[PDB]
Amino acid sequence: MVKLDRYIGVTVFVAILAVLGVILGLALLFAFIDELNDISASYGIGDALRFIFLTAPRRAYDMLPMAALIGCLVGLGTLASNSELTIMRAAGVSLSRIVWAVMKPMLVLMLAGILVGEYVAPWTENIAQSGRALAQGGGDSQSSKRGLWHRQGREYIHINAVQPNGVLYGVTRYRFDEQRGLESASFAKRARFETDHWQLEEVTTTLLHPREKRSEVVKLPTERWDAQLSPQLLNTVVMEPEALSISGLWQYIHYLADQGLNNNRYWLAFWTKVLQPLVTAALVLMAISFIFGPLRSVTLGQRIFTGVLVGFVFRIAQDLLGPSSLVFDFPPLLAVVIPASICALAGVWLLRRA
Amino acid sequence: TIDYYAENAHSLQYQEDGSLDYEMTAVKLEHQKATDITFVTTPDLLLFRGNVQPWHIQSARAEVGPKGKEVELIDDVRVARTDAKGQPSILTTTRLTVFPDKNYAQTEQAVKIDAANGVTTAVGMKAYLKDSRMHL
Amino acid sequence: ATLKAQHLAKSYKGRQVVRDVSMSIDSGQIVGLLGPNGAGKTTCFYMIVGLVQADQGVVRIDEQNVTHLPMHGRARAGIGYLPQEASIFRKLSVSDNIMAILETRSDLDRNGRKEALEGLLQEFHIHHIRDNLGMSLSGGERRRVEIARALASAPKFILLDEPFAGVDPISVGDIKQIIHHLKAKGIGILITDHNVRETLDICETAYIVNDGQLIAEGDAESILANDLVKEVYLGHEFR
Amino acid sequence: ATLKAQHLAKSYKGRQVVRDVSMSIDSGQIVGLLGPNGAGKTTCFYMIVGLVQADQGVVRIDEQNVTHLPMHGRARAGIGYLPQEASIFRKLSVSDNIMAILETRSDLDRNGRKEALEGLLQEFHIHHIRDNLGMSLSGGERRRVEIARALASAPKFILLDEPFAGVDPISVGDIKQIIHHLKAKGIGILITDHNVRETLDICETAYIVNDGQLIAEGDAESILANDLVKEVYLGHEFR
Amino acid sequence: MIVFRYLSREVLVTMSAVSAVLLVIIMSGRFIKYLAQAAQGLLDPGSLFLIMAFRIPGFLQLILPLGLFLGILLAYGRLYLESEMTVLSATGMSQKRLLGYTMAPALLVAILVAWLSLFLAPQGINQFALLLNKQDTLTEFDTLVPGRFQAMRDGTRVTYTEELSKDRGELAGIFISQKDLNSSNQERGISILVAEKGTQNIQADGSRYLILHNGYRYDGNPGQANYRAIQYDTYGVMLPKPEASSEVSERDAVPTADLFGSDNPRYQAELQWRLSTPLLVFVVTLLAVPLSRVNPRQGRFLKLLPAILLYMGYLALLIAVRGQLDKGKIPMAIGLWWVHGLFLAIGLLLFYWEPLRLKLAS
Ligand SMILES: CCCCCCCCCCCCCCCCCC(=O)OC[C@H](COP(=O)(O)OCCN)OC(=O)CCCCCCCCCCCCCCCCC
Ligand SMILES: CCCCCCCCCCCCCCCCCC(=O)OC[C@H](COP(=O)(O)OCCN)OC(=O)CCCCCCCCCCCCCCCCC
């Protein structure tokens, strides 16, 4: 059986591609509208457009399962509403064979999606985030909400922005006394990570002599400070947990568990990233079950509407079950397992119903 | 309400060049929420570098608005010149409308100069803070 | 082979539709199934096909109980099916329309598959259109291609549904010619249709179902003579 | 009253489906409209009804150019209509089903409206089911109620569309009786469907359109004896 | 007069069902964010129910017009597919009569939405704010971890604590740095706070006076000589609630009675916004009738997503115009009504398409 498999696979694949394109376009438009509020004469409209276009791959990867569900629904509905699946069944083919024929392109798409996620989404998402942070953070002592505080010894650091090439922007650090009396307050315009140590550029430190003696100001163009933070950790502590690679999530989870800090959110992100193929398979199975049962001979509009509604309900359930695991101390794996299992069970029931 | 309050504060403020702006000690600092008004009970202002020679102040109470537009010295008012002349030239009146933003010496009432060698009374006070010269 | 449905019976949500209906179709003979729309003619036809499970009764084909088998199980058993509405693979050429089904057959090999496809194309006079897409075919050519596709599975009984519905009088001749051509090969056809005149014209015997129970059966002459049918389905004025 | 359609012509995307087809219905007579499915028969019927705008021609009724009037404008001008599928107000009692239309008639008062509703109910032998909802009625009662409502609109010409579609031979007599009743009332009727036997039996005339042009006309005897229609539409084997 | 009741009942029932579904969806969507905030440490889970109960009317005030839009679409699509409306039109009922028939449920929904948006959303928001101004913030400053930087109120302010007692109080070296996004002059730019121990004092009338055991207060800029060093023993600064008014501006809580006459641009813009919802309901009713004509080929559900998108765009344009008008750029004389005019014109053109084409064909 070669021609029927190709027919079904091509139909579903093209439908999925079109649905994914439309969904990604709508998501990009909504993101642009929502983020248009941040223009401040230092973050131009071109910058926002560049950020959105660079963030597109991450959102496409995130929304791939919904596109798969809706596209499979539409394609199978197009096939069935023309009395073609009935002919195939009456010719000897079986529902298991039809499900396999639909799933094979789904397997290819799942492999492509996992690869794209874990090998591209981090890179482009990081590039976009770094660009936006650099655009918004070339300001003053502490003038960005994309910043990053820190503390070592008795000196409290700040960082306006962090760049992928091991360069910081606007490093302001306060040095105190054992008596908690301030002694200095510096502001370095940039910083670069020489392998041995951090190097500052164009600092403007001001020294406050404790006593009533004269207060002075000094300017060292290339002052050098030895700090504990490292570029690799900095590039990870800022990015959202859901934007890291699978290997990056694994490494950060182990690094956190090493020092005793909790990592439930990172466990949730890792489980949601690694178990996506199972969720996609369950969603496609539920869609196939819908086609053979209730939505047997309904119009295309009803198929699209029901697919969108089911996708919205599933997304809301899985999003509410995410933080709920952290709040209620649920194992993070359940928040991912539950909705997919429910959808697969419902699909299997409706399929057994014939 | 009061947004921030302090007890037995001993604050320092430095000039743009680096010289001391003043050294004020107050019993309590109160900043109401309705306006940026700070009450400094019993201030001890000392313009250490405002005029090189400190201007000792022993005002019983001082009222400060959002800015130093009118830091009025209410109740006991004292101005110990402490300049090259050994005469304190302490002025008491009831209030002294110092102008930190304007930086001028003006009196809200008749000037009562309690000098060392001789005490004199003058009407009004119009004298530059930097100059430090007697002027009605 | 002799398809046999014995004591079929189904009940819908509220009321019974078919009760104690028995049928029998033998290879090489055409059997029509006619009755009032409210009757259980359609439900009996679909239960024989397998679309709707039958509460009671056994549907067996030559001493092989296929009552519990699914639609594809029966299709492998030997039964066929031809839906009334258009059921042609729109984006597949006619040659592909036939070869896609021809692939599923287990016995055939590549050379055998190609030879069978050529024979089927020549048999039904669709050679000239062996490249047109399914969506571009007319009613007559579409029906010929559909019948060729149905035959490509090598069925033992083909259950046509409303063959004459929505066809002008000129095309009913071609439809009847196709049905007789199928009957010549040995297949047995079970026609259900609204057009009683043509169905009785072609079918060799007819089964009439009134309220879930078949009320008459026999040749066309006998069916036209029964008074119960004349009072329930045909009417006195008929013919 | 006479509903005249003159030189009707309609061109779809790039094809001229109908070209210069002229028909005329006179009050008190039944006129049929038959032809092959592909040809311009349904298109002409709709251009007369108002569901498709005519590129050329004038559909005038009693010297009113009603080609441009919308469907409600025609309905107020005298013409009527009756959709092929069931079109009864589902969740509305039959009496309310007719009164919903009776209330619109301007030239009536409350007592007059009640008397007219009673006359309509007793004239179509649907009085006993006067309280049933629209969902309960079966085929015959549903058709009778729909006809009673259409009449309650008080039309001049009633354009039936496929009245003999999927009806048992026994029930066709009731529809023929209803059509004869309407004709006796003095209402010109236009009928179109694929039942070339019942339509020719009931109809007083028939217009056959093939390839978008009128190819024949006249009573059933002339139509059947005609040769062009036989070769293109009816087929030699017919009759 | 029977078709009037029939259509009104159909439209009202469908609108009620769609409104219930939309309300459930929206409430779950916002509960997602609230639960995320609670899991992050802020907020108190016990107060979520009250927050949602007091915020429901604000959701309804915007859901109801969309509910009516979709209900009209679904009901009239059903009546078109089942041939009832074809028979209605083939008997005399024009489309202006149909609009008149459908303008009764629209009027009832407009009355309901006006009541909501003018006398229940303000009171609901006021109660929400009053019951949110509670121990929630007192919990947040108790959420401090001995090694975490809680950047309260975006990037303006931060908070730190080397060591915090489990029972609260007797904190270790505390560091609090606040920056003002305004001009800030020079000294007001950055102001840090360091106290050796620090403590929290519950106000007799206020929320909490964080009492610092001993420390300093520093003001100025990192690259400037002037620095106001304040040395104290006890220092007290209240802790504002992170969500006291962040998600609810005071413009919403003011009763509609006070909005009249006030020359404050924000108040007048809010008053114009409050009156826009009934007009929106009537406009959606006007432009939902012609769009409800669907043949069986394209079904009944095809044009629901585009309708939702159109309604969302309408609301977004209204809100953007309201903001740019309350910020002073758009003159108040033109106001917010030109958006209503634009959508009324588009709906009117959509409604008169068939008559215009028929007149075009002589
Ligand atoms: C930095 C990168 C930024 C990328 C930004 C991307 C923005 C996307 C916005 C798209 C908005 C418009 C969507 C247009 C597509 C839908 C239109 C439609 O109905 O198309 C139907 C068409 C039918 O296919 P046809 O060629 O007719 O073949 C039929 C086979 N019998 O269907 C088709 O097959 C044609 C449509 C194909 C659409 C392909 C695009 C969808 C997936 C895009 C993923 C992009 C990111 C993925 C990762 C990239 C990593 C580098
Ligand atoms: C089948 C579906 C049918 C329905 C289609 C949808 C039609 C809806 C039409 C209405 C669209 C609503 C758009 C809402 C925009 C909201 C903008 C906003 O909130 O930002 C306001 C922003 C403030 O800027 P400001 O502060 O003045 O700048 C100085 C900075 N201190 O202001 C600005 O900076 C303004 C700059 C705007 C630049 C263009 C932005 C793109 C807008 C695209 C909207 C969608 C268009 C889709 C059309 C499809 C038609 C078929």
Author numbering:
A (entry chain G): 1 to 354
B (entry chain C): 47 to 182
C (entry chain A), D (entry chain B): 2 to 240
E (entry chain F): 1 to 362
List passages from the publication reporting this PDB structure.
The IM sub-complex comprises the ATP-binding cassette (ABC) transporter LptB2FGC, which extracts LPS from the IM and delivers it to the periplasmic components of the Lpt system. LptB2FGC is a type VI ABC transporter consisting of 5 subunits. The LptB cytoplasmic subunits form the nucleotide-binding domains (NBDs) that capture and hydrolyse ATP. LptF and LptG possess transmembrane helices that create a cavity and a translocation path for LPS, as well as a periplasmic β-jellyroll domain.
We also obtained two cryo-EM 3D reconstitutions of LptB2FGC at resolutions of 3.26 Å and 3.61 Å, respectively. These two structures were assigned as LptB2FGC-I and LptB2FGC-II. These regions appear to perform a rigid body rotation motion toward the outer leaflet of IM, similarly to what we observed for LptB2FG. The TMD and NBD domains of LptB2FGC are similar to those of the LptB2FG structures and represent the resting state. In our LptB2FGC structures, the periplasmic β-jellyroll of LptC was clearly resolved and found to form a trimeric interface: LptC and LptF form the primary LPS transfer path, while a loop from LptG (residues 209–215) binds onto the N-terminal β-jellyroll of LptC (residues 60–69). Intriguingly, in contrast to previously documented LptB2FGC structures, the transmembrane helix of LptC remained unobservable in these maps, indicating its flexibility and a lack of engagement with LptF and LptG at Interface 1. This, in turn, results in an unobstructed entry point for LPS into the TMD cavity. Similar to LptB2FG, we identified four lipids in the transmembrane region of the form I conformation, which likely originate from nanodisc reconstitution.
